[PDB]
Write a protein that binds this ligand. Sequence first.
Ligand SMILES: Nc1ncnc2c1ncn2[C@@H]1O[C@H](COP(=O)(O)OP(=O)(O)O)[C@@H](O)[C@H]1O
Ligand SMILES: Nc1ncnc2c1ncn2[C@@H]1O[C@H](COP(=O)(O)OP(=O)(O)O)[C@@H](O)[C@H]1O
Lengths: 626, 466
Amino acid sequence: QLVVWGTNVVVSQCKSKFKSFIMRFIDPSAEQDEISENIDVNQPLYLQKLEEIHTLEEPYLNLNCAHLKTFDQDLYRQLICYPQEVIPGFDMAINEMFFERYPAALLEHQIQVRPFNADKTRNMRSLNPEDMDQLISISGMVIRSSNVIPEMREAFFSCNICSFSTTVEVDRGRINQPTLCTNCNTNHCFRLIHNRSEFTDKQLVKLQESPDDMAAGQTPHNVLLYAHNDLVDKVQPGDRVTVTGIYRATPLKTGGLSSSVKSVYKTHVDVVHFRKVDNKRLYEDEEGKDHIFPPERVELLQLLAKKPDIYDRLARAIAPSIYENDDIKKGILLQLFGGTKKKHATLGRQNFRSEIHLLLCGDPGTSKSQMLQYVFNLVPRSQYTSGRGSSAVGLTAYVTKDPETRQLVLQTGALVLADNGVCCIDEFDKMNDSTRSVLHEVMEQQTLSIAKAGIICQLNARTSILAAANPAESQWNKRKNIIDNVQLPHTLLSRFDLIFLVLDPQDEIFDKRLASHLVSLYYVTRHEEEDTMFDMSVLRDYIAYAREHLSPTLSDEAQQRLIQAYVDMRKVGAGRGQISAYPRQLESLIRLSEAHAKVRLSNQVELLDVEEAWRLHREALKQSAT
Amino acid sequence: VKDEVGIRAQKLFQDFLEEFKEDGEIKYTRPAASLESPDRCTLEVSFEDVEKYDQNLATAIIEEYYHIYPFLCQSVSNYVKDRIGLKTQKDCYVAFTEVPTRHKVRDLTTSKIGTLIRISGQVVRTHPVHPELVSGVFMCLDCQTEIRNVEQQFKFTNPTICRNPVCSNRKRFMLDVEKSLFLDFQKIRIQETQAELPRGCIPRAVEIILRSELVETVQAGDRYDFTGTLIVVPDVSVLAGVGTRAENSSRHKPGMRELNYRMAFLACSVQATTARFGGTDLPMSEVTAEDMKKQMTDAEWHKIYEMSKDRNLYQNLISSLFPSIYGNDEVKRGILLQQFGGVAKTTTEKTSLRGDINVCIVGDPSTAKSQFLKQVSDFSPRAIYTSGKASSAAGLTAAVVRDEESFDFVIEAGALMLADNGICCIDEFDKMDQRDQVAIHEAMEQQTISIARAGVRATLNARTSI
DNA sequence: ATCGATCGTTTTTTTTTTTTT
DNA sequence: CGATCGAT
Ligand SMILES: Nc1ncnc2c1ncn2[C@@H]1O[C@H](COP(=O)(O)OP(=O)(O)O)[C@@H](O)[C@H]1O
Ligand SMILES: Nc1ncnc2c1ncn2[C@@H]1O[C@H](COP(=O)(O)OP(=O)(O)O)[C@@H](O)[C@H]1O
C-alpha cells in the first residue's frame, strides 16, 4: 500500500526477497548452478563473505546479478527500472547481515553493492529513449585520468551578537534560512561562510568504444562518466574496462544571459561498478614491498642456484622456441640478472656504478627487432623506441601549454622514467648528431644537468642498454669490418665495452629444421614443457629476488689473471690507425665478474666469471685481426 | 565558542616557555626578542614541542587548523604582550617544521583539510610578486567611518550595513590605503615528485601560494616541505559543474551565483633542501668555538694556523684530495690554484681587473682526465659542470624563440652564463663547432659580452676560469 | 513600511602572410 | 533580472 509516485515498487519486498535469496544460498550460483563444481561451503557466500571481510575488516563488497537470476526476477526487473530505488535495500540487507554475522561488529563503516551481469546492451552506437533508467554495460578504450573536485551539501555560519555559529545542509538544491541562522530576535542578518562545511569528492573522465566491435572504418563515438568517492581514479589511462550504470539526462542552458533552457538534454551514465582489466604478462613492477616472496619459493630458487647447469638454463629459457646459436644468451643473462650494485655511499668520491653496457649488431636476418619486441614483453622497465621514434627533446622536456592550469608548464621526459631499465632499440645509425651526443654524456657519466629559460635542472638518470644497431649497408661488407662498416668514428668505435657481434648464419642447411619445427609450433599453437622446462614464475623470482639481497665481494679470486697478463695486454701501443687494448677493460671485467657472481648468488667473489669473461672477450675481440 | 581550548592551550604553552622551555632556556623567545625591534611577525614553532608539553594537541591541531590558525595569532600577540609594552600591530606568520609525515599528490579528498603536512615536488614556470591591500575602511557616507574590522576575507565585500547609525547599508564610504592592514604573496606551480615517478597518468600539478617571509626563496629545481592547508577556494565562476545547485530560500510569512568550486593549495612552511650550502661562519661538523674576524669564518684557527704553517702541507694537501687517484704531480698542485684565489686588488677606475686564470688538460686517451673533473661538480660551490654539446648553443645563449608567449623574442640567459664565481667546465674542446668557440675567444678575457638580433641592451659577463 | 509598477538589460570569432635565422 | 520610485 506504499510506493513512490511514478513507480510500482516497494522497498520491503526487495529487501526481504534479497535477504531470503542470500539465506537461500549455499553459494548455489556456482554450487547448484556449477553443481559439477562444489565450493565446500553449504552456507551463503554472503555470510561467508561477511566473515571473510569482517575477519579482514576491509569493507566494500561487490555483487553480480547472475546470483540474482535464479530467485524471482521481480527483484531483478524492479531493480532494472528502479535501480536507484532498489540498490540501497541490498545494503540494508547487508546491514542486517552484520547482525547475522556479529552483533557488535563495525556497524558504522559501510558496504557497497556493485551488481552487474544482465547482458551487454549492444554497444554505444545504438540507443533509445526508453533506456534512460535502466542497466547498461559496454566497454572500449580510455582517454584520460582527470583531476578531482569537491561538492557541498552544507555551509558554515556566523553571527555578531552571542555568536549564533551554526550550519544546515542541503536536500539537493533547495535551502531555507531565517534572517539569522539559529535566529532569535534577529540581532543581525544571516552570516554564511563557505569553508567549514560539508563536501564530497567526485570526478569525471571520458571513455571510448573501441574493441574490434567496430562500425568498421568508423571513428568510435565516445561516451562520458562521472565518478564517486570509492571509485575515484579507480583506473589510469590506456585501459579497457567494463561499465555499470544508469542513464542520466540533463538540460542545457540556452543563452546564459538568462535562464532559458534548451531542448537537447545531454546524457551520461552514473556509476555503480567497473571491471579493471589487467594484462601484465612480463616480469612485473618494482614496488619492493608488494612483491615479497615466500620461503617455499626460496627452496626452488636456491634449487635453481644448485645447478651448475644454471649457467646455461636461464639463457636457454630466454627464447620461447628459438634453438639456434644461443651462445650469447649467457652474455645476455648478465643483464637479465641486471648488474651488481657497487654503491658509492662509501667515500663520496668517483661514483663508479657497475655500469653494464652491451649492444647487438649485425644483419637484418637476425630477429633483433622481433626478439626484442618480445623482450619488451619481458623487461620490467620495458621500453621500445629506436632511431627516428623520438628526438633528444623527444626523450626529454615535452613542454607545451596546459589548459588545466590555464598556463604552460615545464614538463616531461623519457629516460628519467626508465632508471635502471632498458629500451630495446634498433636503427642506431639513423639519428642526427643532436642525439647521440647525449648518449656520450650518459654512457660516460650517467648524468644530466639542464639549462632552459624556465626551469633549470640537475636531475639523476642512469640505466643499462639494449640496442639493435645497424650499418649503412645491407650486409656487413666482407673484408670491411664494423670498425668502419657501421658509420662511427675511429676509437669511439673502440670505446664500447664489447658489442657481441651478430651476422647472418653463413650456412644454407639449417633453415629447414626450424622452418619446419617452429612452423609446426604454429600448426599446434601450443608448447610442451620438455627438458626446456618453462617455469611459470620459478624463473621469474630468481630474476626478481636476485636484485636486492646480494652483495658481491672480492677477496682474492677474480682479479689477478690480467693483473699479471697486462704485459702483452698493453704491448698494444703499436699499430697504424688501429684500435687496441686500454685500461678501462678491467673495470668492465670486474663488473662482469660481480654480475656472474650474481648468478650462483656467491656473496663473495666468483672466480669462474673470469673464465667466461675471457671467453666473452676473445670470441668477439678477434673479429678484426685483419 | 569552539577553540577557546586552543586559546588556553597556546596561552599556557607561552606561560610555560615564559619560564624555561628547554634547560632554563627557550628557543622561541630570542627569535621573538630579535623580532621585538622591527616586529616582522614570523616565528616557526616546533611541532614536536606540542607533543612535549601540550600532550598531543597535534590531533587537536592537525584537522581543525584552518579555523584554529587565526587564534594562534592572537596567542602570538598575547605572548608578545606579557613582557613588551605592546600595541596590536603584532601579526603571525609561521614556517612550521618538526613534522614527521610526508604525503604526496595522490591522497587528496574532502577529508584532507586543515593539516600541516610536509610535501615536496618541483618548481616550474614561476610567477611574480603581486601585492594585496586586503583591508581598509568602509561604511556609510556621512561621518561614521572608522572601520578596522574583520573585512579582510578573500571574498571581498565593500558593502557593510552600519556600525553606529541608521544610515546607508549599500552606499559605502570611500577607501583607506593609508592606515589599515595589507600584505603580500606570490603564486607558482609545482610538478609531480621525482622521488615518486610512477607510470601512466601525468604529473598532476598543484597550485601554491606563499606568505611574506617565504617569498622569492623558491626557485626552479628544488624540493620542499609544505603545510597541509588544503582549501575551500573562494572561486567566482567555472564551467562543466552541472551538479545540483542550492541557496537559502528564506522563511515565507504572511545575490545568486552559480556554485562550482575548484581546488588549489596553500602552504606556510619551507625547507628548500638539497639547495643549501653556507659559507664559513656556519659551524660545520668540525669546528673550534673561538673568537675571530667573524663568527666561524676562521674560529678553527686553532688548527687552520697549523694548516697554514707547515712547509709540508703543500705536498700533503696535494695528496689530501687525490687519495683514489695517481698520475703526475704537477696538475695535482696546479689545478688547485684555479680553485684558489688570485689577486683581489683595491685600486682604480681604470677597468675591471681579473682574479682568475685559464686552465687546461690534454692527454692521451683513457687517462682519467675526466675523473679529475667528474668529481669537481660534486666538489665546489657555484661550479656545476656539464658538456658543451650536452646542450646546444642554448648553452651559451638561451633557447632562441620565434613564437609569441610573452613578447615573442627571448634570449636572456644560458648555461655557461649562470656560473658566477664557479666554473662550469666542459669536455671535448676539439670537435665542437666554431660558434661558442669564437664566443669564448673574448668571453674569457673581456668578461663583458653582447649579442644582437634579440638584445635587451645585451651586456652579459663571464666570471670564472675553465 | 509596505507592495507593486516603474525604470534599463545583450554578446561571437581561428587562421594566413611575410619575416628571420 | 535587476534597481528605482510612487503611493497606500
Ligand atoms: N629464431 C627466430 N625465431 C623467430 N623468428 C626469427 C628467428 N630468426 C629470424 N627470425 C625472423 O627474422 C626476421 C628478423 O627481422 P628483424 O630483426 O625484425 O630485422 P632487423 O634485423 O632490421 O630488426 C623476423 O621477421 C623474424 O620473424
Ligand atoms: N691514476 C688513475 N686513477 C684512477 N683511475 C684511473 C687512473 N688512470 C686511469 N684510470 C681509469 O681510466 C679511465 C680513463 O677513461 P677516460 O680518460 O675518462 O676516457 P677518455 O680518454 O675518453 O676521457 C677512467 O675510468 C679511470 O677510472
